[PDB]
A paper describes a structure:
Brain butyrylcholinesterase ([name]) is an attractive target for drugs designed for the treatment of Alzheimer’s disease (AD) in its advanced stages. In the case of [name], the active site is buried at the bottom of a deep aromatic gorge, at the entrance of which there is a peripheral binding site (main contributors, Asp70, Ala277). The active site features a choline-binding pocket (main contributor, Trp82) and an acyl binding pocket (main contributors, Trp231, Leu286, Phe329, Phe398), which accommodate the choline and butyrate moieties, respectively, of the substrate butyrylcholine (or its analogue, butyryl thiocholine). The catalytic activity features residues Ser198, His438, and Glu325.
The common property of all of these three types of inhibitors is the position of the naphthalene moiety, which fits into the acyl binding pocket of huBChE. However, the piperidine groups of inhibitors 1 and 2 points towards the entrance of the aromatic active-site gorge, while for inhibitor 3, it fits into the choline-binding pocket and it is instead the methoxyethyl group that is oriented into the gorge. Therefore, elongation of the methoxymethyl group was the most straightforward approach to graft a fluorophore onto inhibitor 3, to yield 3A. This compound retained good [name] inhibitory activity, with an IC50 of 60 nM, but instead showed poor solubility in aqueous buffers. As seen for the complex structure of parent inhibitor 3 with [name], the sulphonamide oxygens of 3A and 3B form H-bonds with the hydroxyl group of Thr120. Similarly, no clear electron density is seen for the fluorescent coumarin and the triethyleneglycol linker of 3A, and only the first carbon attached to the sulphonamide nitrogen was modelled. The low solubility of probe 3A might indeed lead to non-specific interactions with huBChE and limit is use, and it was therefore not included further. For 3A, cryo-protection was achieved with the mother-liquor complemented with 17% glycerol and 1 mM 3A.
Numbering used by the authors:
A (entry chain A): 3 to 529
B (entry chain B): 4 to 529
Write the structure that this text describes.
């Protein structure tokens, strides 16, 4: 029998067959009291011992969230939708241990993304069994409250203070500290990693002192807190909370009466009103997300970073080549996943209105000008690809580069990557390229399964990315081998060297899209 | 020796140039003196004189303000007039090879000076070397500048505008009716000029009255589509009424304003021209060409797009550092006597001086486009960016635009880019290859070996002198020497041009295209 004794009771696990070996899996371990009833909108309360044996034998419920039904039956959009039942009772975590049991393994802890409104740790592409089997690490993931139930903010009021989902994550990190040694893990070798809003979450754990003692190193894939979508200002969050009360019939005089009212609404009557709390919303609007709660985050994050008040440790950071294209099919005129999406100069200007609703006409013109210095003005696809780059540069690439730059200047080793490979099984059209979220299966080893119709070069790439990630976790260095391997050099603010990742040639390059990012760092804020 | 003009007889003189002889006629009158009741009117054709005119000395230069910013400094005073000033100034010069030629091509020079200054008798416009070395006839003329040449009340023949342009046209007319008596071919005539003279040349390409008076055109550092080249009818009227206010000539109708301005001492007109525009820059053109309904029937850019101009070959070019000259006449931190290192805040202050009507957003976009440094460390970055802003906007990018549009009508265009800094240049090294300092090479001054030029400068000057004369004679700026690079036509697709310098003359494409894309496709939207 597969049984491990946690400090909240015993828990029973499960054996998995992975590449002629065994991976012991505990799926759905609870880490907090279910945020039901009077605990709705509050920080996670710690758990009390249970008598029996908890059966960590299946994935648990995913936290309440709206679903993406833009393309029913499409694997491209539905692979991100939750694959378990939805419930407010969702604060569970999973653990993958290599077999035979290790004596002191390094732990990788995964924070999924989803714009702080969607996501779940039980998706097929976050399966930690391959990492555990191939690299001998313990892999941990946790479900955390998303949407208004996770990030509703009446700042200073304990009944709904903001950043609950971030505290959800942090309490899972407290569990790993208190419990992972019992499974074979080293609490002193813990690496957080995550993608998109999960990468923004990872970078926020670097700033928050409460998290500092709970992990060793960080990996940020396609996200960081200085992204334009990551953090809501103190009082914009409160004003979206009030608009939600009004939208549900919960506008009261004192705040505790608003929260008391919101607690009697059904989850689905809250979810159906979240989209409306912001007046003109981009396809990248974070309705309810992190805020300066004065508890998890004591100041706006850009200030803490500039003043050097953050955890001093090594970071691995990177972005994909076409981060932006995924968002053009969700509201830009002339874009479909089913045609080649060739657009015109005015269809471009209307695309910019969708993504920059508050920017002036002079500002929207300067953007268009910076992205229209064609190398071949005969190329029809010019405007289709220019708009994807604008969305990609402004929202993901340039902030991640600027975060790495600023972080590197305080004396800790940073590494930057450019993921350039398109999946051979990607369900989306060609014109979208190396999309947001499509390095994850390569990081989690899914191409190592040959039963899965992957190309041999993709297995070699995935095997290489898996080794580099797990080595960065163990040693603070993302090396593959000492010989027959490109040395991945440190990102330094002068040279700004990064490593590209693809099947043809992994190269050391410099100053990724500097001419583009110079626009967003040095001209766009002045507009 | 004496030659018979259709209006009288003129006596010349013999010049010994490089062992040979050049026959010069300096100071032939081509129009009645625009005095008293002819002030502000178009030039009137001249009456015959019975005796002999002695065209043996440079004539009076037209009334104009003098640059006295740097007293005793050759770099500025070499552009000041070197004959006495007077409204009696409509004379011209003629240089002829010796022995007398047969049917020689004529090069007619039109000087610049912002339509405010200039004379044909400057040392750097000496046509004796051009005649000796290439056996061409060289003609230059004086034309009225300032308000005395370009005061405009549109529709009124007492002050119609463009009077200085008609001065030039009447000199071109003189050449058609007299250059044969001298040995020249009236049907082989090439206009060339620099700056305001180049812009003037390009305006003769548009005006129908001038079409039959020349064959080809050379445009050095200037063209009519430059921001400084043409005053709109509105600002021309606002500047004419301001001048009357400043001289006590504010009247109720136009005819009386002109009667009053005709009785003002020339210095009282000259010394008020500076105050007619409130927000001026070092490139301000107080009184210049306008849409007069006569010399220009429409706005020049409209004429250009529509193809209503003289179709012929053109030779067009610019220098590398066109903008520097103007940075020492207003921009803060700049001086001819130090290295003029400036800061980002001082760069923002220079922009305000050259773009006084532009929003802070627009001035920000200029700044941003010119600060993508190749080397972030070099302290000369902002000094080089400002002179590049002034040069690109005012000279380089208009001249490229002109050549593209002109050539698209089936005309052979040739574009050059002058990169040589004169070893004798009196201005500091940071100003580089300044506006106006290719003229010595076009006119053959470095061919005088007793002059402190370098050997390479003599070689370079001979190449340009040859290419220029060949373009006039044949329509192709080829050089006869075997080792010379072949000069291709400028066309809209490939946009090929020829660099000029001592080292090696290359052939390049799309000159400064990245900078000029700002000035054509984004700046008119701020
Ligand atoms: C008055 N101006 C005085 C200028 C001040 C700057 C240039 N230097 C000549 C000079 C000095 C030093 C090296 C070369 C030349 C004299 S200007 O000659 O009339 C004038 C006005 C607008 C113009 C607009 C455009 C072009 C020329 C223009 C001339
Ligand atoms: C705070 O937010 C309010 C939002 O009021 C709105 O009402 C909600 C119920 C929801 O329907 C939102 O989409 C609405 O925008 C801002 O209010 C603005 O001014 C009036 C006031 O009600 C509103 O009708 C306008 O639509 C809002 N303006 C815009 C441009 O949408 C308010 O400005 C925000 N800030 C502050 C300080 O209160
Ligand atoms: C050593 O192994 C290489 C594989 O490794 C490459 O891996 C990249 C991540 C990067 O670090 C790079 O510097 C490094 O060279 C083998 O080379 C490959 O060889 C096969 C043929 O067997 C080719 O089909 C592959 O395209 C090629 N991959 C390349 C060049 O990236 C090779 O087995 C071995 N080479 C030597 C010299 O020992
Ligand atoms: C332009 O105006 C001049 C003069 O303007 C005169 O207008 C009058 C109303 C009056 O206020 C007077 O003080 C002012 O000077 C005209 O010349 C004038 O012609 C009239 C004959 O009709 C004479 O009686 C005036 O003495 C004479 N004035 C002068 C100064 O000579 C002129 O005719 C007029 N022309 C046009 C086209 O408007
Ligand atoms: C058209 O001309 C008017 C008249 O302006 C004055 O400017 C002085 C320097 C001087 O030449 C004087 O003789 C002349 O009267 C211009 O008007 C001025 O505009 C500025 C704003 O830029 C105001 O501050 C002034 O008060 C105003 N003056 C007057 C008398 O109204 C006007 O700007 C000009 N327009 C154009 C497009 O050139
Ligand atoms: C070519 O240069 C010589 C002298 O070379 C330079 O020497 C410098 C110290 C300075 O004097 C500078 O002016 C000069 O250019 C010129 O010869 C001298 O010119 C001055 C007047 O400018 C006469 O007074 C001298 O007698 C004369 N000869 C000397 C000093 O030996 C010469 O004029 C010049 N040529 C041209 C065309 O500029
Ligand atoms: C990757 O690089 C690290 C160095 O950053 C290597 O680390 C050492 O690893 C061994 C275990 O094999 C330890 O016993 C040492 O104490 C480590 N030293 C340091 C300074 O980190 C690691 O072995 C390398 N891995 C590969 C596959 O080359
Ligand atoms: C697991 O590895 C850690 C080291 O990461 C071991 O801890 C020791 O070394 C730490 C730093 O290198 C220090 O904290 C201590 O020296 C020590 N840790 C203690 C005393 O808690 C840890 O013992 C290992 N556990 C095993 C091998 O079972
Ligand atoms: C799960 O699989 C593991 C390994 O495949 C089983 O446990 C091991 O079984 C092997 C062979 O029977 C023994 O040599 C090891 O000593 C066992 N390890 C431990 C820790 O017991 C285990 O029986 C399987 N679980 C089941 C069948 O429930
Ligand atoms: C967990 O499941 C228990 C029964 O499952 C089984 O019995 C044990 C002894 C093992 O043999 C296991 O493989 C079987 O599947 C329940 O009795 C128990 O109540 C469950 N736990 C909870 C918390 O409900
Ligand atoms: C130069 O001088 C005389 C002067 O009459 C002129 O006619 C002739 O061209 C020249 N003399 C020669 C060439 O002997
Ligand atoms: C014409 O020029 C000659 C040349 O010296 C001179 O002798 C003669 O007096 C001049 N005639 C005039 C000025 O009438
Ligand atoms: C030269 O002059 C003659 C004189 O009649 C004229 O016919 C001819 O057209 C002119 N041009 C050339 C190129 O000969
Ligand atoms: C250059 O000289 C000018 C005028 O004397 C002065 O205003 C400027 O500050 C000086 N700059 C430098 C760098 O010497
Ligand atoms: C494809 O998407 C929609 C049609 O469903 C349309 O708006 C768009 O123009 C199409 N693209 C084409 C025809 O290129
Ligand atoms: C250039 O001059 C004319 C014009 O084409 C021509 O007769 C001559 O052969 C050309 N010479 C060279 C070297 O191109
Ligand atoms: Cl996602
Ligand atoms: Cl395509
Ligand atoms: Cl000049
Ligand atoms: Cl003007
Ligand atoms: Cl007078």
């Amino acid at each position: 029998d597969i049984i491990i004794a946690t400090k909240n009771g015993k828990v029973r696990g499960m054996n998995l067959t992975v590449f002629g070996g065994t991976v012991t899996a505990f799926l759905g371990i609870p880490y907090a009291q279910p945020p039901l009833g009077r605990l709705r909108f509050k920080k996670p309360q710690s758990l009390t011992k249970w008598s029996d044996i908890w059966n960590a034998t299946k994935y648990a419920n995913s936290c309440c969230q709206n679903i993406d039904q833009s393309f029913p039956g499409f694997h491209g959009s539905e692979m991100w939708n939750p694959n378990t039942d939805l419930s407010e009772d969702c604060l569970y975590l999973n653990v993958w241990i290599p077999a035979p049991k290790p004596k002191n393994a390094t732990v990788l802890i995964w924070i999924y993304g989803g714009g702080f409104q969607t996501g779940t740790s039980s998706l097929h592409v976050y399966d930690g069994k391959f990492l555990a089997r191939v690299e001998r690490v313990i892999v941990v993931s946790m479900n955390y409250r998303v949407g208004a139930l996770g990030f509703l903010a009446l700042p200073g009021n304990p009944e709904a203070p903001g950043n609950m989902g971030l505290f959800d994550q942090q309490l899972a990190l407290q569990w790993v500290q208190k419990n992972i040694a019992a499974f074979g893990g080293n609490p002193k070798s813990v690496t957080l990693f995550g993608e998109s809003a999960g990468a923004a979450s990872v970078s926020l754990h670097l700033l928050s002192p409460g998290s500092h003692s709970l992990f060793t190193r960080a990996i940020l894939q396609s996200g960081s807190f200085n992204a334009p979508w990551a953090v809501t200002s103190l009082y914009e969050a409160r004003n979206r909370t009030l608009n939600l009360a009004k939208l549900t019939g919960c506008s009261r005089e004192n705040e505790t009466e608003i929260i008391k009212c919101l607690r009697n609404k059904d989850p689905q009557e809250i979810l159906l009103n979240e989209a409306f709390v912001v007046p003109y919303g981009t396809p990248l609007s974070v309705n309810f997300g992190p805020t300066v709660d004065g508890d998890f985050l004591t100041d706006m994050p850009d200030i803490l970073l500039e003043l050097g008040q953050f955890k001093k440790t090594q970071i691995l950071v990177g972005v994909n080549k076409d981060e932006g294209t995924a968002f053009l099919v969700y509201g830009a005129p002339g874009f479909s996943k089913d045609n080649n999406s060739i657009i015109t100069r005015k269809e471009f200007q209307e695309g910019l209105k969708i993504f920059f609703p508050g920017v002036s006409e002079f500002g929207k013109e300067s953007i268009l000008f910076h992205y229209t210095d064609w190398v071949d003005d005969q190329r029809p696809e010019n405007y289709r690809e220019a708009l994807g780059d604008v969305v990609g540069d402004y929202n993901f690439i340039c902030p991640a580069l600027e975060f790495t730059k600023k972080f590197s200047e305080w004396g800790n080793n940073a590494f930057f990557y450019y993921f350039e490979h398109r999946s051979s099984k990607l369900p989306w059209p060609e014109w979208m390229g190396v999309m947001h979220g499509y390095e994850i299966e390569f990081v989690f080893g899914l191409p190592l399964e040959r039963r899965d119709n992957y190309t041999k070069a993709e297995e070699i790439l995935s095997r290489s990315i898996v080794k580099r990630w797990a080595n960065f976790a163990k040693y603070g260095n993302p090396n593959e081998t000492q010989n027959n391997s490109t040395s991945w050099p440190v990102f330094k603010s002068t040279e700004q060297k990064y490593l590209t990742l693809n099947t043809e040639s992994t190269r050391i390059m410099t100053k990724l899209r500097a001419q583009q990012c110079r626009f967003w760092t040095s001209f766009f804020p002045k507009v």
